[PDB]
Design a protein around this ligand. Structure first.
Ligand SMILES: COc1ccc(C2(C(=O)N3CCOC[C@H](Cc4cccc5[nH]ncc45)C3)CCCC2)cc1
Ligand SMILES: [Zn+2]
Ligand SMILES: [Zn+2]
Ligand SMILES: [Zn+2]
Length: 437
């Protein structure tokens, strides 16, 4: 055996299908039907009668289970030794090495090494935005001159044109009356950061963004929104991990500012317990920050951006609307999946059809969570040329949003819960991106 350890995958968390946001953690009790519809023990017993609509399926046909199934880790056999070894430990992928697995001992005994690993992070197609970010990170790393650090690769893996649609409450008030556009076009992008750790790629950062160009009507035009952020905390060295995140995030703001976007938007929202934003099965000791801590962290990152003469200034949404002399909810930027489109639906219902009644009160209530970042200020923003993106569209269904990658990771036991598993998951992720390309 490679190690002395007996290893297996932890059970993943499933949905309860009752409260539409309820989740079933590890070792919990739940009910299943056809392994498709799972129900919380509390939510299932708080059900009308026996018949449950799914077609009505009776509660008699449901399975009472505990979320404690442990799938053992897989082994691979050396085609010369016969030695059985963990697939994750030796990082053997059948697509990269279709000739069969040969252990390190056999390779050295015959004075050879594995064939070069195609489908690497470096060999992913590059972009102007990706090169811009990885130059910034690697230049910073050489300045710090830590011998433990490795080369960082940043690649944009998806780009497509989409639209966000105004929800029925806001649509009935402002869209049907002609006061607001019914949809806002934007380009979505997914990019990841990789670090070479002992000769092996490790994906440690991911990000999805929404970019609304000069074609977009107000109030969305020339604005960028960060849909989701995620990380795996195994960047080496640890003492430089936060700074690298700052380099990527500030670099993105610097890049879109150069392109002509005037404002960036960040919703400082930590994930719920047991929830994964981009990377499936985070390490158990990678703690989720509390909201106050996360807000201060973004402040520090933005403060550095201001000092670097990249970000002009930043304010919370409540302060921004006051300076913008906002009066109606139709003047607030409308982003896909954002907090505010959902809340404006609730605000109109409670107000009897008003888009202004509790607008400032709601913004003040949640002001510390929403950051409005001004990249271009004053007279310069009034007369800018059209935004032209030098990078082409990158069709990649696996990265059209965060759902496909999470599903693939769930379906293939691709965990990021440890360095070895995250390296195996990185290798599998890279192979998928190269074949789907
Ligand atoms: C102040 O401490 C931090 C500040 C920022 C981050 C970043 C990040 O990754 N965030 C910020 C939101 O909370 C942490 C999420 C990571 C995470 C941790 C544990 C379980 C999870 N499930 N899903 C996501 C997830 C995603 C790092 C780079 C960008 C900001 C991480 C920790
Ligand atoms: Zn092992
Ligand atoms: Zn539930
Ligand atoms: Zn061998």
């Amino acid at each position: 055996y490679c190690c002395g350890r007996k290893l297996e995958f932890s059970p993943q968390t499933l949905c309860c299908y009752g409260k539409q946001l309820c989740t079933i953690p590890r070792d919990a009790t739940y009910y299943s039907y056809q392994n498709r519809y799972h129900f919380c023990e509390k939510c299932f017993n708080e059900i009308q009668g026996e018949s449950v609509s799914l077609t009505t399926i009776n509660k008699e046909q449901f399975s009472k289970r505990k979320n404690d199934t442990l799938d053992p880790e897989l082994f691979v056999e050396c085609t010369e030794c016969g030695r059985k070894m963990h697939q994750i430990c030796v990082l053997h992928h059948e697509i990269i090495w279709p000739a069969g697995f040969v252990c390190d001992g056999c390779l050295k005994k015959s004075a050879r090494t594995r064939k070069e690993n195609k489908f690497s992070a470096k060999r992913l197609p590059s972009t102007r935005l990706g090169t811009f970010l990885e130059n910034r990170v690697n230049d910073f790393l050489r300045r710090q001159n830590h011998p433990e650090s490795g080369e960082v690769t940043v690649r944009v893996v998806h780009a497509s044109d989409k639209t966000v649609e105004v929800k029925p409450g806001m649509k009935a008030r402002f869209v049907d009356s002609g006061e607001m556009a019914e949809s806002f076009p934007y380009r979505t992008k997914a990019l990841f950061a990789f670090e070479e750790i002992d000769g092996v790629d490790l994906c440690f950062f991911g990000m999805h963004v929404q970019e609304y160009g000069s074609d977009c009507p107000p109030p969305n035009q020339r604005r960028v929104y960060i849909s989701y952020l995620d990380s795996v905390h195994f960047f080496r060295p640890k003492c430089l991990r936060t700074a690298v995140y700052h380099e990527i995030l500030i670099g993105y703001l610097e890049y879109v500012k150069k392109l002509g976007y005037t404002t960036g938007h960040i919703w400082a929202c930590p994930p719920s317990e047991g929830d994964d934003y981009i990377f499936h099965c985070h390490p158990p000791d990678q703690k989720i920050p509390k909201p106050k801590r996360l807000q201060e962290w973004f402040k520090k990152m933005l403060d550095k951006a201001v000092s670097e003469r990249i970000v002009h200034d930043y304010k919370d949404i409540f302060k921004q609307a006051t300076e913008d002399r906002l009066t109606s909810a139709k003047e607030l930027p409308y982003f896909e999946g954002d907090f505010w489109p959902n809340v404006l639906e609730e605000s109109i219902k409670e107000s009897g059809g008003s888009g202004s009644q509790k607008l400032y009160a709601t913004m003040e209530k949640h002001k510390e969570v929403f950051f409005v970042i001004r990249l271009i200020a004053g007279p310069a923003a009034n007369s800018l040329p059209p935004i032209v993106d030098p990078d082409p569209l990158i069709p990649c269904d696996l990265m059209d949003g965060r759902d496909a990658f999470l599903t693939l990771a769930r379906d293939k036991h691709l965990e990021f819960s440890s360095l070895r598993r995250a390296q195996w998951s990185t290798m599998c992720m890279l192979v998928e991106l190269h074949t789907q390309s």
